[PDB]
Amino acid sequence: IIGGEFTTIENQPWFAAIYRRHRGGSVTYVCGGSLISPCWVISATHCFIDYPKKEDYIVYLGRSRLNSNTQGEMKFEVENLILHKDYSADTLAHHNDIALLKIRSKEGRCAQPSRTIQTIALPSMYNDPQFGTSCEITGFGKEQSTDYLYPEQLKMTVVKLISHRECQQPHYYGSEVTTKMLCAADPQWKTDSCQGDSGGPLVCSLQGRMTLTGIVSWGRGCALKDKPGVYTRVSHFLPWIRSHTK
Numbered sequence: 001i002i003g004g005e006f007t008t009i010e011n012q013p014w015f016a017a018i019y020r021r022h023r024g025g026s027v028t029y030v031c032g033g034s035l036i037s038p039c040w041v042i043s044a045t046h047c048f049i050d051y052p053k054k055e056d057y058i059v060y061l062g063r064s065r066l067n068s069n070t071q072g073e074m075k076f077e078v079e080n081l082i083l084h085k086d087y088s089a090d091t092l093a094h095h096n097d098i099a100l101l102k103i104r105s106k107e108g109r110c111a112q113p114s115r116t117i118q119t120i121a122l123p124s125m126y127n128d129p130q131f132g133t134s135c136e137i138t139g140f141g142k143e144q145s146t147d148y149l150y151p152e153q154l155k156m157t158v159v160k161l162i163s164h165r166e167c168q169q170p171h172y173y174g175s176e177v178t179t180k181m182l183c184a185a186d187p188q189w190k191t192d193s194c195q196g197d198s199g200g201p202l203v204c205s206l207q208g209r210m211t212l213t214g215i216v217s218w219g220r221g222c223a224l225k226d227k228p229g230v231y232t233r234v235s236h237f238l239p240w241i242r243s244h245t246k
């Protein structure tokens with residue numbers, strides 16, 4: 001997250017921190033995700049497509065820090081790693097960039113809701129906020145495009161939704177943005193998602209309900225003029241989510 005503010009998991013208790021074990025046993029951060037039901041975390045396919053083996057992954061809930069334990073956190077294995085079979089990536093845009101992780105602990109349990117672990121509501125089908133609506137994004141991604149390190153402490157910021165028409169202008173993203181994506185940015189371009197924020201939540205309030213409107217997917221750099229963050233438009237994937245979560 002470029003700009004924005006530090007936070008803790010209490011302010012985004014559906015946020016899932018996803019890591020990968022290497023041969024040798026090194027563990028590194030991969031991507032964010034969102035708890036949509038006790039057993040299901042939703043994220044982005046591009047986070048996993050190069051290492052699709054479920055056994056490599058570790059998912060934490062209730063975690064506010066990248067490389068230290070947060071009191072009350074839960075650790076999970078990945079029982080099913082479900083990537084979208086129509087996923088595609090051209091030089092910039094990721095299409096159908098959505099993934100499901102069925103989580104299960106060493107004791108064989110799903111997520112147990114607490115002060116630091118809660119689910120987020122999915123939107124109703126094709127029901128998104130109007131352009132100009134302020135939404136929030138959360139993650140452990142870079143604080144500056146030129147950074148090497150990721151922040152140790154979770155961050156959040158606010159971005160405003162941009163219409164399909166504005167985002168499809170050639171000087172934004174042209175035909176790279178489809179109706180299954182949502183663009184969002186700051187009016188001054190001063191805050192945004194960045195590398196490491198992929199898979200995490202774009203949350204908007206719709207009818208007074210906090211809603212998983214988007215999943216951090218792609219962008220040309222970070223906090224750059226005319227280059228919004230692009231998000232998987234969750235409200236256009238409800239049949240796929242329904243068909244893969246029983």
Ligand SMILES: NCc1ccc(Br)cc1
Pocket residue numbers: 192193194195196197198216217218219220221222223228229230
């Ligand atoms: N590389 C993932 C990513 C997505 C959106 C923005 Br904005 C920046 C980076």
